[PDB]
Design a protein around this ligand. Structure first.
Ligand SMILES: CCCCCCCCCCCCCCCCCC(=O)OC[C@H](COP(=O)([O-])OCC(O)COP(=O)([O-])OC[C@@H](COC(=O)CCCCCCCCCCCCCCCCC)OC(=O)CCCCCCCCCCCCCCCCC)OC(=O)CCCCCCCCCCCCCCCCC
Ligand SMILES: CCCCCCCCCCCCCCCCCC(=O)OC[C@H](COP(=O)(O)OCCN)OC(=O)CCCCCCCCCCCCCCCCC
Ligand SMILES: CCCCCCCCCCCCCCCCCC(=O)OC[C@H](COP(=O)(O)OCCN)OC(=O)CCCCCCCCCCCCCCCCC
Ligand SMILES: CCCCCCCCCCCC(=O)OC[C@H](COP(=O)(O)OCC[N+](C)(C)C)OC(=O)CCCCCCCCCCC
Ligand SMILES: CCCCCCCCCCCC(=O)OC[C@H](COP(=O)(O)OCC[N+](C)(C)C)OC(=O)CCCCCCCCCCC
Ligand code: SF4
Lengths: 118, 119, 506, 105, 136, 60, 155, 49, 80, 93, 149, 137
């Protein structure tokens, strides 16, 4: 699950890196580090939960929460997980990649029709 | 100039360059191939490097931008991200209201003022 | 003691304010750490007990009396190098303040000593690759420690690429060995020393040959040494060979069990070719560091003949040679860091650009050193005479002992070439002596006040003002008399090398 | 001494036994030389790559070619597609030949 | 119906009020976009000066088809109050083709929505593909 | 506040000869950038005519 | 139809013709993906995922990060296909014919009732048996943090 | 010596392509049988000329 | 075919292209180790492969850092 | 470095100077611009930039507003020719 | 004042998860159960009159190496990877249907076809040098050279 | 554990990629049908950048570079915690103490890069203030 997400990160930065538009090519160096920086936080949080159950299986983690939900012992990690999740999808308030007031559509200011939808 | 541009240490006098098989001038016509024979260091502060005057990254924060709540052409000259110089190009909404008021009576000139600050 | 103190220096250096006095004082903290390391090492480690060979850390590291000799030598030579950065090499603030502009200099050096001292001890292919990277990564950082310099950064980029290919060859040989046997520990591989492809250990040597600058790979080492600052070249051109040549000797010790002749012919092909380039190469050069780069290659060629022969006299030849060559190397570079005060100053033709990184860069900048400082000129003369091989200096006994090991094993062809190559190289060692002194009598009575040393301020005009700092002068004098007067205690030293064993026993 | 040849479950793997018998012989004190352990060294290499046994398979393939022995009648029956390990092939009494389910266990 | 945020002057204030809570253009599927690539409707809301005119043509050319242009207010329509000025284009239809003209100074928010509703009725009347089968 | 690129101070000259040096200097500056004028403005004519028409307006 | 051959022939075709640094970084990604996919099937699924997590997620996007920093500036069809065809003919990495033509099996056994993943054993040995290898690695990582800052940081 | 040293000076130049190519050539010494060394010794002597 | 050194034709003409070839070269070593370890059912080979992947990452970071500072050293006027 | 020579550069100076209509079409080192060529204000300055375009060189206003003899220009160019800057990737590879 | 028009999309997203989950839980359970009824298609489809209530088998997760040995062992007994049977004695076909898979041990395709990954000091000696292979071929030869004794 | 159901999913997603691209290419009206003024190629006005209307023509901070560069050492630290996760029980206290030591040495790096403030962008170029000092005679 963490490996698959990091392939998507590579997909995001490639959009602008093949473009000469200043707005589109602006959102690569800032896009790259934002996803790079909050990937360590998201990866470590997943590993702490995996450490509490000593399993890297999704099904085992869910079943391990029968008597207690990990929001009660690890509430701070849930805030940290949710904050990190916002950055990885580039959602606001971590919106600086595709900021309309700052960089218009970001990488999508050069995208239209099917490349925009996908 | 317009298109390109070009010490902390003692000026050291080196005279009499010689190797084991002869002196410099005896092999100076071949030393263009021997790169360990280059007398021109590339770290000397006086090293002439003809570098072009590449203009600073100049973004056009042009009118078609949500930030430009009118018609603004903001020209930003920056080093990296920190802004060095900014050149606002106003006038994209110049309609010559001041020229038009002079041809209308005081009662007709009033509506020209609701259209200065729209809000 | 080394590792624990390194963490304290890392944290402390990042706290205190950036200044030259504090940077120079922290460099004197490292000089203590290296000294403390030697006292703890010599206390527990003894020749009499390490003779059998002792496995450490789950057999990953194996230590014996041959490796133990070099660890103490490495620590000693690292003390003499840190004395340069920790005290004044000239005393002129303009030239010296380069050594104190970097706070991580001593930290990276302390990183390397951990890398250098553990490499001879490795006993697992898994830890061989890790340790060789710890040493290799520390050299690239030290080469680029002066990140403002264009030549220094260009050299580290060249160093990183060549070393990366060198490390890949080393990594690939170990993988191939693991493919055949499935074993990682070197002792377990020795059980199958007759059942594995012995040329995969040769592919391992081809990687270690790149890192010591052996022809045909010599090209990058000459370029690197002639571009880095003289303080940097003084370290990176000697230290890697101290710890890699010890490792190469051990790997060749295991290899000669099966006594494969094809392996010896290829290595003799490289030793023979390197002597040719190491001798004829330096004939037409103007840069001193390029000259000492070709000089270094020739001495590595001699030291490989002792390694290649690999007998009981080869331990003595290698152990003695590696010690005397280090002291000679330190002595020569220390002098070049000092005699830069006698350079003239312009008040023209050939437009020679000098920088604060290599103030002494050309051989003819040694001109008239017999006049400006006669005592230090003889010290440079004695050091060069040792490299030539004039008896009864230290250099003669290195070549004499190497020849014994070489001819006792039938390397007649290589023994004659090394004696031809030694004489050819004497031409360009003699040029350094020609520049030092030969124009003395024409320049004897000259009106010289434009030297760099003449820009030093006058303190009192009543007290005596020595021209050279205290510590650097004592080091130069000590190593010059040790080079010169080895004949006095030579018999004890050589008999002190008969005892260094590598599984000889009985 | 360090562990070598550790299985994917933490225990000794297939060829650890052979390697251990080699170490016992090499580090033994009653041996004058390493000659007696030469056969054990071959077995450890044999256990890992089966080079001698693969060679024996090559001759039995080649010898049958020069005699005309039919491969289908000297060799052993095999199935290449796992979906067609049908109960007819497995020999079950009333087994169909319809494919088996190898989608999800 | 994603327009392009091309508000120039006081006509743009009424354009933003269409998106305000009371009228809520978004409830009809109208989202203002800041780029021609993602927009198909150009709304000229304000005075088109001579200096702005070449930029307006460039922004128009960068919109992928199909595209429609609405002229809002008297300035865009025919100059308006500034018809006899030395720096005002007397009608944006001298620069780009205009599909519908919204009258007013400024048009009320409902007047602009009537213009948008009128254009949608026209877009639903298109026969782009039946034209191929019959007219072609 | 700092002036923009290629800006100059506005000084009222009082000598005739002084002006011509400025006038002649400025002429090459137009000529020097002529190729860039074509490149930046994507002009359909070679830079030769761009240099050609600059000179005429000075003489006027 | 071992289609893994066709992926590399395309890859081997574009490695001979790449000009800029955009295509050079593309050869990297186009090489890991066959490496990951051929590890996912066949040999080791654990190290296919470790490669994606560590190579693609960590060291590959660093290349494109610095390419945007460095710069972006600036053969014949007969010779390429001739070279690729010549490269295509001889693909036997080893010359033990029996080792490459004769198949082998293993026999399973039930003696291992404590079945756990490979990453369980690797951690079991790395944190106990070879704890020196693990500790030196954190030491090599430590030197890099110091090493990066001294090389790049200006003041 | 003037002839030999003038060739050797032409070889020391900072160039990744040159050093990389030399290294990969040296892998041939592991492939060729050792009895071919003297021919490589003659071939080297020729390219001096 | 590769005995004529064909791989030199396959390496681009930028310093960054050399860095990639070093990674692709080392990648072959790790894949070889994973291949042997799985066949032998030996986890010690998998420990080696894990170290090779981690060590090959540190090598990339240092090399890029040198390359990055190499690039800015030319573009070091900064007199604006 | 500047790999140019005084004799060779004049050939580039001669041929490019041939591009303006003059009373005397023959060109040497001592050929002047007002007398030997008969150029006014604008014709001279067009020649200077044309020579600048050939030599990768830019005159200064001090020199360019005072030139009478050609040889000074050939003196100017040889004393003011620098190699075009090499990019980071081009230098070492 | 709860807006129901605002919650309409959520009730549709709730149905999206339920649609996928409802299908997966039932379809996979039905398929696993049906194939665990007997060794032929005329048994799997039909339900006998004298058969009792049907006991569905839920899909299995978090397996290990014993579940790969148990699955094949169940296959040789019932014709299904998750068959059910508790006969104290197996069929006599159980002793002649053990499946032992034979597969090659060749290096990956990328390791031996990549334009760059295949170049190495030791990989050339494996590919172009006979030194290793002639030495090993001696041991293979001496296997058949020792059958005489 | 069987993964033939997973394989069909990956294959279908691969097929879904070709469908998304081509569905646009088969449903858009022909350029002649809309306005005929040209294809995307010749219509260079439509096939160009967006610069808000006006036609115009990366020296990034070193702090951004050190953010990305230091990502790599801190990533290899996190990825090498993976073996400890699935073996926390069977390594016991011994592997737990080693793991903590493995983290302390890396933390000393965190201290070093926290004290130097390597990631801070800083402002060395601007934001200067001075004291007006009279120089009476
Ligand atoms: C939740 C359960 C509430 C409930 O069952 O009764 C109210 C609720 C109807 O609310 P209502 O009719 O507006 O209340 C009567 C007045 O109109 C209510 O009008 P009102 O404006 O006077 O209501 C005042 C009340 C707010 O009205 C409420 O009572 C909602 C409080 C629920 C809060 C948590 C949800 O108080 C507030 O305004 C503050 C509440 C917000 C504080 C922060 C939220 C707490 C968490 O009854 C229902 O459950 C049925 C409608 C719910 C949607 C079902 C269909 C969903 C769409 C599917 C497709 C069709
Ligand atoms: C300063 C030099 C300090 C010399 C210290 C050498 C030493 O203490 O160990 C000698 C070592 C023998 O030690 P070992 O055989 O293992 O058993 C005895 C251990 N208790 O013998 C060895 O094998 C060590 C091999 C290296 C010896 C290098 C020779 C020393 C060179 C002296 C340099 C002097 C420089 C002048 C110092 C100026 C200080 C301001
Ligand atoms: C889901 C599919 C994702 C891939 C879609 C693109 C497929 C097209 C084929 C490229 C991929 C083949 C793998 C080999 C890399 C070749 C890269 C290359 O040489 O450039 C290709 C691309 C188009 O340029 P082209 O005309 O082909 O070459 C001359 C251009 N001066 O030059 C460009 O850089 C244009 C932008 C392409 C960016 C692609 C990024 C690299 C590929 C990573 C994704 C796929 C991973 C590899 C999977 C297949 C491996 C064999
Ligand atoms: C429980 C429940 O109400 O489930 C009924 C479901 C969905 O509920 P919902 O209120 O849309 O869940 C969304 C809950 N939020 C408000 C937290 C997003 O809708 C139907 O099946 C009809
Ligand atoms: C899924 C989407 C559902 C709703 C949209 C369907 C509209 C597309 C139909 C269409 O394209 O029909 C019109 C077409 C051809 O006419 P055209 O205008 O040149 O087609 C434009 C598209 N071409 C040119 C790429 C083909 O007729 C047929 O091929 C009839 C079968
Ligand atoms: S038409 Fe009226 S409201 Fe609209 S921009 Fe012009 S003056 Fe303003």
């Amino acid at each position: 699950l963490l490996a698959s997400g990091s392939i998507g990160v590579f997909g995001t930065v490639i959009v602008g890196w093949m473009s000469n538009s200043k707005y589109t090519v602006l959102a690569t160096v800032r896009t790259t580090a934002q996803l790079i920086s909050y990937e360590l936080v998201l990866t470590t949080v997943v590993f702490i939960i995996a450490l509490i159950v000593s399993s890297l299986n999704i099904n085992v983690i869910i079943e391990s929460q029968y008597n207690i939900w990990y929001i009660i012992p690890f509430f701070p990690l849930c805030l940290i997980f949710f904050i990190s999740a916002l950055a990885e999808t580039a959602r606001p308030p971590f919106d600086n990649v595709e900021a309309e007031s700052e960089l218009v559509s970001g990488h999508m200011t050069e995208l239209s029709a099917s490349p925009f939808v996908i | 100039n317009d298109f390109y541009d070009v010490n902390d240490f003692f000026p050291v006098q080196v005279d009499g360059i010689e190797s084991s098989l002869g002196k410099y001038e005896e092999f100076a016509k071949d030393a263009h191939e021997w790169e360990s024979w280059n007398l021109q260091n590339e770290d000397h502060p006086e090293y002439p490097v003809k570098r072009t005057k590449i203009r600073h990254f100049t973004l056009n924060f042009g009118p078609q931008h949500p930030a430009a709540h009118g018609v603004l052409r903001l020209i930003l000259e920056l080093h990296g991200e920190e802004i060095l110089r900014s050149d606002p190009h106003v006038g994209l909404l110049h309609r010559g209201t001041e020229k038009l008021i002079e041809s209308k009576t005081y009662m007709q000139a009033l509506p020209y003022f609701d259209r200065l600050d729209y809000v | 003691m080394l590792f624990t103190s390194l963490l304290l220096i890392i944290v402390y250096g990042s706290l205190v304010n950036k200044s030259h006095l504090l940077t120079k004082l922290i460099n004197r903290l490292g000089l203590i750490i290296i000294i403390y390391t030697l006292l703890i090492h010599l206390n527990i480690n003894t020749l009499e007990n390490l003779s059998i060979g002792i496995n450490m850390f789950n057999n990953l590291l194996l230590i014996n009396s041959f490796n133990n000799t070099i660890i103490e030598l490495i620590l000693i030579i690292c003390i003499l190098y840190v004395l340069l950065i920790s005290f004044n090499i000239t005393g002129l603030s303009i030239i010296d303040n380069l050594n104190y502009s970097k706070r991580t200099f001593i930290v990276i050096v302390l990183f390397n000593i951990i890398g250098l001292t553990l490499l001879p001890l490795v006993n697992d292919i898994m830890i061989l690759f890790i340790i060789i990277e710890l040493q290799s990564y520390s050299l690239y950082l030290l080469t680029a420690i002066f990140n403002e310099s264009h030549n220094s950064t260009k050299s580290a980029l060249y160093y990183f690429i060549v070393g990366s290919i060198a490390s890949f060859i080393i990594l690939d040989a170990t993988v191939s060995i693991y493919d055949d046997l499935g074993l990682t520990n070197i002792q377990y591989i020795l059980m199958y020393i007759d059942k594995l492809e012995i040329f995969d250990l040769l592919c391992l040597l081809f990687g270690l040959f790149i890192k010591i600058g052996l022809a045909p790979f010599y090209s990058y080492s000459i370029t690197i040494y002639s571009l880095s600052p003289t303080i940097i070249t003084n370290y990176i051109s000697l230290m890697p060979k101290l710890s890699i040549l010890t490792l190469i000797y051990i790997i060749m010790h295991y290899i000669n069990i099966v006594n494969n002749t094809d392996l010896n012919y290829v290595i003799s092909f490289l030793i023979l070719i390197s002597m040719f380039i190491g001798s004829f190469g330096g004939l037409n050069v103007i840069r001193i560091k390029t000259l000492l780069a070709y000089s270094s290659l020739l001495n590595v060629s001699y030291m490989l003949l002792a390694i290649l022969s690999n007998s009981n006299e080869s331990i003595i030849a290698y152990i003695y040679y590696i010690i005397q060559y280090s002291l000679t190397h330190i002595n020569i570079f220390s002098i070049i860091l000092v005699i830069s005060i006698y350079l003239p100053i312009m008040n023209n033709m050939l437009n020679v650009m000098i920088t604060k990184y290599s103030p002494i860069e050309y051989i003819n900048q040694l001109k008239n050193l017999f006049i400006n400082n006669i005592f230090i000129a003889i010290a440079l003369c004695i050091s060069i005479f040792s490299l030539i091989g004039i008896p009864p200096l230290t250099g003669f006994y290195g070549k004499y002992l190497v020849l014994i090991s070489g001819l006792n094993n039938g390397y007649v062809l290589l023994s004659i070439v090394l004696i031809i190559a030694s004489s050819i190289s004497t031409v360009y060692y003699a040029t350094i002596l020609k520049v030092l002194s030969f124009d003395t009598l024409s320049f004897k009575d000259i009106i010289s006040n434009n030297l760099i040393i003449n820009t030093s301020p006058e303190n009192n005009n009543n007290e005596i003002k020595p021209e050279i700092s205290n510590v650097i002068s004592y080091v130069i004098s000590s190593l010059t008399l040790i080079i010169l007067l080895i004949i006095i205690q030579y018999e004890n030293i050589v008999k002190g090398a008969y005892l260094v064993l590598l599984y000889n026993w009985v | 001494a360090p562990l070598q040849q550790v299985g994917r479950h933490g225990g000794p793997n297939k060829c650890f036994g052979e390697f251990q018998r080699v170490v016992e012989c090499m580090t033994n004190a009653k041996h004058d030389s390493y000659e007696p352990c030469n056969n054990l060294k071959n077995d450890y290499l044999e256990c890992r790559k089966h080079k001698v046994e693969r060679y024996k398979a090559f001759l039995m393939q080649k010898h049958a070619e020069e005699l005309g022995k039919d491969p289908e009648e000297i060799g052993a029956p095999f199935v290449r597609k796992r979906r067609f390990l049908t109960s007819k092939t497995l020999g079950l009494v009333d087994g169909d030949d319809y494919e088996i389910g190898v989608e999800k266990i | 119906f994603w327009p392009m945020t091309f508000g120039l002057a006081c006509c743009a204030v009424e354009m933003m009020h269409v998106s305000a809570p009371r009228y809520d253009q978004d409830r009809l599927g109208i989202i203002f976009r800041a780029s021609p690539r993602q927009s198909d409707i150009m709304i000229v809301a304000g005075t088109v000066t001579n200096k702005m005119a070449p930029a307006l043509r460039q922004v128009y050319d960068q919109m992928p088809y199909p595209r429609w242009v609405i002229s809002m207010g008297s300035c865009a329509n025919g100059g308006g109050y500034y018809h006899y000025s030395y720096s005002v284009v007397r009608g944006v239809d001298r620069i780009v083709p205009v599909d519908i003209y919204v009258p007013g100074c400024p048009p009320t928010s409902e007047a602009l929505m009537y213009g948008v509703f009128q254009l949608q009725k026209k877009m639903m009347d298109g026969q782009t593909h039946r034209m191929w089968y019959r007219s072609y | 506040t700092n002036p923009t690129a290629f800006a100059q101070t506005t000084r009222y000259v009082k000598d005739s000869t002084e002006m011509r040096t400025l006038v002649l200097n400025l002429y090459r500056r137009y000529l020097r950038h002529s190729r860039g004028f074509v490149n930046n403005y994507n002009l359909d004519i070679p830079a030769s005519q761009v240099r050609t028409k600059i000179r005429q307006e000075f003489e006027r | 139809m071992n289609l893994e051959i066709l992926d590399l022939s395309i890859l081997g075709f574009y490695s001979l013709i790449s000009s800029n640094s955009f295509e050079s970084i593309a050869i990297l990604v186009a090489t890991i993906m066959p490496v990951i996919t051929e590890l996912w099937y066949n040999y080791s699924q654990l190290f296919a995922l470790l490669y994606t997590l560590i190579y693609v997620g960590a060291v590959v996007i660093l290349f494109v990060f610095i390419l945007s920093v460095i710069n972006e500036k600036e053969s014949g069809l007969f010779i390429l296909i001739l070279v690729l065809l010549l490269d295509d003919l001889d693909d036997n990495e080893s010359n033990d014919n029996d080792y490459n033509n004769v198949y082998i099996t293993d026999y399973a056994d039930w003696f291992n009732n404590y079945n756990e993943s490979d990453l369980s054993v690797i951690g079991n040995l790395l944190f106990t048996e070879y704890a020196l290898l693990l500790l030196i690695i954190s030491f090599i990582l430590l030197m890099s943090i110091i090493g990066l800052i001294l090389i790049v940081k200006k003041d | 010596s003037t002839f030999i040293s003038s060739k050797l000076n032409k070889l020391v130049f900072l160039n990744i392509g040159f050093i990389l190519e030399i290294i990969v050539l040296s892998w041939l010494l592991i492939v060729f049988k050792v009895s071919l060394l003297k021919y490589i010794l003659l071939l080297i002597i020729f390219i001096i000329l | 075919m590769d005995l004529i050194l064909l791989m030199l034709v396959a390496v681009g003409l930028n310093i960054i292209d050399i860095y990639i070839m070093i990674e692709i070269l080392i990648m072959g070593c790790t894949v070889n180790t994973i291949y042997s370890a799985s066949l032998d059912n030996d986890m010690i080979g998998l420990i080696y492969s894990l170290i090779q992947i981690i060590i090959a990452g540190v090598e990339s970071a240092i090399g890029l850092s040198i390359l990055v500072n190499y690039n800015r050293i030319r573009n070091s006027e900064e007199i604006e | 470095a500047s790999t140019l020579t005084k004799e060779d550069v004049l050939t580039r100076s001669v041929s490019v100077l041939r591009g303006f209509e003059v009373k005397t079409k023959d060109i040497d080192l001592q050929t002047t611009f007002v007398q030997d060529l008969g150029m006014d204000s604008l014709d001279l300055n067009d020649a200077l930039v044309a020579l600048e375009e050939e030599f990768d060189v830019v005159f200064d206003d001090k020199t360019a507003n005072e030139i009478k003899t050609v040889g000074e220009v050939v003196d100017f160019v040889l004393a003011n020719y620098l190699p075009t800057e090499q990019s980071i990737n081009h230098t070492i590879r | 004042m709860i807006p129901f028009e605002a919650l309409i999309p959520y009730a549709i997203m709730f149905a999206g998860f339920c649609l996928g989950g409802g299908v997966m839980n039932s379809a996979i359970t039905a398929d696993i159960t049906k194939r665990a009824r007997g060794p032929n298609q005329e048994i799997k489809r039909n339900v006998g009159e004298d058969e009792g209530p049907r006991n569905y088998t839920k899909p299995r997760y978090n397996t290990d190496q014993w579940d790969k040995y148990f699955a094949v062992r169940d296959l040789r007994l019932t014709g299904s990877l998750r068959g059910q049977s508790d006969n104290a004695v197996a069929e006599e076909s159980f002793k002649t249907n053990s499946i032992q898979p034979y597969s090659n041990t060749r290096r990956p395709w990328v390791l031996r076809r990549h334009i760059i990954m295949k170049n190495s000091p030791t990989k050339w000696a494996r590919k172009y040098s006979s030194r290793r292979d002639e030495r090993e071929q001696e041991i293979k030869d001496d296997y058949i050279r020792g059958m005489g004794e | 554990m069987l993964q033939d159901l997973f394989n069909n999913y990956v294959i279908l997603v691969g097929i879904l990629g070709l469908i998304f691209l081509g569905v646009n290419y088969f449903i858009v009206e022909s350029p002649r049908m809309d306005e005929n003024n040209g294809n995307i190629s010749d219509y260079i006005e439509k096939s160009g950048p967006f610069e808000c209307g006006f036609s115009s023509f990366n020296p990034i901070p070193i702090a951004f570079i050190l953010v990305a560069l230091l990502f790599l050492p801190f990533d290899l630290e996190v990825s090498s915690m993976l073996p400890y996760i699935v073996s926390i029980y069977s390594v016991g206290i011994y592997g737990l103490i080693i793991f903590i030591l493995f983290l302390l040495i890396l933390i000393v790096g965190f201290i070093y890069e926290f004290n130097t403030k390597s990631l801070s962008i800083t402002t060395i170029l601007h934001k200067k203030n001075k004291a007006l000092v009279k120089n009476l005679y």
